[PDB]
A paper describes a structure:
In addition to these, Centers for Disease Control and Prevention detected resistant polymorphic mutation PB2-H357N in A/turkey/Minnesota/833/80 (H4N2) while testing nonseasonal influenza viruses from their collection. According to the yet unpublished data, this strain is naturally resistant to pimodivir and mutation H357N conferred approximately 100-fold increase in EC50. Mutation H357N increased polymerase activity and showed enhanced pathogenic phenotype. For the H357N mutant, the enthalpic and entropic contributions were less favorable of 0.5 kcal.mol−1 and 2.5 kcal.mol−1, respectively. Phenylalanine/tyrosine 404 and histidine/asparagine 357N create the π–π stacking interaction with pimodivir as well. The RMSD values for ligands referenced to the PB2-WT are PB2-F404Y–0.12 Å, PB2-M431I–0.16 Å, PB2-H357N–0.29 Å. The H357N and F404Y mutations caused a considerable loss of the stabilization “free” energy for water molecules 1 to 4. W2 and W3 became even repulsive upon the F404Y mutation. These changes resulted in a larger decrease in binding affinity of pimodivir to PB2 upon the H357N and F404Y mutations.
Residue numbers in the entry: 320 to 490
């Protein structure tokens, strides 16, 4: 509808709709989180200083992320935000230790920001447990492995790196 900020990226919804439904989820540390799950199919653009992306998602499901970034670190930053934003069970179950993050005032962060801060600290467990898949047509986009190196054979599930800037899909 209108643009919002998450993880250093401006997001804008380009199509679709969702409704919030409260769900209780267990983390990989058996901590209960109360998350307002977005239910529906939606498409987004993401813009950051060093990466842009197209995000297509459904209820707790990253269907596809196409990322264009300056370097491996910048691409990884966009992927992490997209994986948290997806609200996938896979991402919740990749949490290690308990989440009790607070802001500058002593106020507990909301669960989505708990998750974001967690995986922005270290995404290695998230990347290693997300899943990989074989990729075929590499003419327009290539794969990225859990170690953030390129591949023309495999990729993180639903993740592709564009061989071009993304104005063509933003238009
Ligand atoms: O425009 C904004 O509000 C923000 C949001 C969207 C992208 C940046 C980070 C978040 C942006 N802020 C700024 N970007 C930039 C900027 C430099 N090179 C870039 N390349 C791509 C890009 F996209 C933004 C930038 N410079 C100063 C900024 F202040
Ligand atoms: O839901 C919220 O509390 C906030 C915080 C956590 C993620 C977004 C940015 C901060 C969120 N804000 C917004 N989310 C959404 C939104 C649509 N579909 C989604 N699927 C998963 C998700 F996670 C957030 C969304 N749209 C507009 C927003 F403005």
């Amino acid at each position: 509808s209108s643009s919002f900020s998450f993880g250093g990226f401006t997001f804008k919804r380009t199509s679709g709709s969702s409704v919030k439904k409260e769900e209780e989820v267990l983390t990989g540390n058996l901590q209960t989180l109360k998350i307002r799950v977005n239910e529906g199919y939606e498409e987004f653009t993401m813009v950051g200083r060093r990466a842009t992306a197209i995000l297509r998602k459904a209820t707790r499901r990253l269907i596809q992320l196409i990322v264009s970034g300056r370097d491996e670190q910048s691409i990884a930053e966009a992927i992490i935000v997209a994986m948290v934003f997806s609200q996938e069970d896979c991402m919740i179950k990749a949490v290690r230790g308990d989440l009790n993050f607070v802001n500058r005032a002593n106020q507990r962060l909301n669960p989505m920001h708990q998750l974001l801060r967690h995986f922005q600290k270290d995404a290695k467990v998230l990347f290693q447990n997300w899943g990989i898949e074989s990729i075929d047509n590499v003419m327009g986009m290539i794969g990225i492995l859990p170690d953030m190196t390129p591949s023309t054979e495999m990729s993180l599930r639903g993740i592709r790196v564009s061989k071009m800037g993304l104005e063509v899909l933003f238009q």
